[PDB]
Design a protein around this ligand. Structure first.
Ligand SMILES: O=C(Nc1nc2ccccc2[nH]1)c1cccc(CN2C(=O)N(Cc3cccc(C(=O)Nc4nc5ccccc5[nH]4)c3)[C@H](Cc3ccccc3)[C@H](O)[C@@H](O)[C@H]2Cc2ccccc2)c1
Lengths: 99, 99
């Protein structure tokens, strides 16, 4: 659908059997989610934002359903203030910007 | 134009007589630019991001031209790693997300 930006572009995701809301974030290269229960092995990673750097657990091959749309990719789980869907997944659900 | 998200959505802006490149960022509420010479009066502000919070100077009613589109708005200048156009200006140039 089309989303204007007068509000935050929030969507529902289902991940790991849990329902969450997340921002569709075109500035973010990677998807990063607040700390939560995911099955599996992960590897530590460090990522940067405004404010500085944080350490996150990287999970690969995770299935996310964003709106109805399923995608599989790497997810980083970490101390973010908000769940953000980044370009790695936005690409898979066919998201574009238009102006 | 429509922009797909396989690469960072960068655009040229002109602000304060100077030409810069900036990311179109649907997840950012506010616009935040690296340190630069703006004239005028400003206010301290702190904003948060992934990584922590930073202190910035807020300038109001500044003209930006982003592509050939003029907008006036608040801009925050400070130590971001990259210039970010946030939704406060994205709404003025008519930007939309579509999937
Ligand atoms: O993959 C990422 N990295 C990365 N991959 C890697 C791979 C390998 C190694 C290292 C790596 N590193 C990555 C993923 C997600 C987010 C970010 C960092 N990231 C933000 O940090 N941000 C804060 C941001 C940016 C601009 C403006 C604001 C804003 O207005 N805030 C605000 N607070 C306030 C308090 C009071 C009053 C007014 C206020 N206003 C906020 C928001 C996301 C966000 C939104 C809400 C809450 C938390 C985070 C932007 O949307 C994002 O695109 C982006 C912007 C940005 C992009 C690059 C550099 C710096 C910044 C990076």
């Amino acid at each position: 659908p089309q989303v204007t930006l007068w509000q935050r572009p929030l969507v529902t995701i289902k991940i790991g059997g849990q329902l969450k809301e997340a921002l569709l974030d075109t500035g973010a290269d990677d998807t990063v989610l607040e700390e939560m229960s995911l099955p599996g092995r992960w590897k530590p990673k460090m990522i940067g934002g405004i404010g500085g750097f944080i350490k996150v657990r990287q999970y690969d091959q995770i299935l996310i359903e964003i709106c109805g749309h399923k995608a599989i990719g790497t997810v980083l789980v970490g101390p973010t203030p908000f769940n953000v869907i980044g370009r790695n997944l936005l690409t898979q659900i066919g998201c574009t910007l238009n102006f």
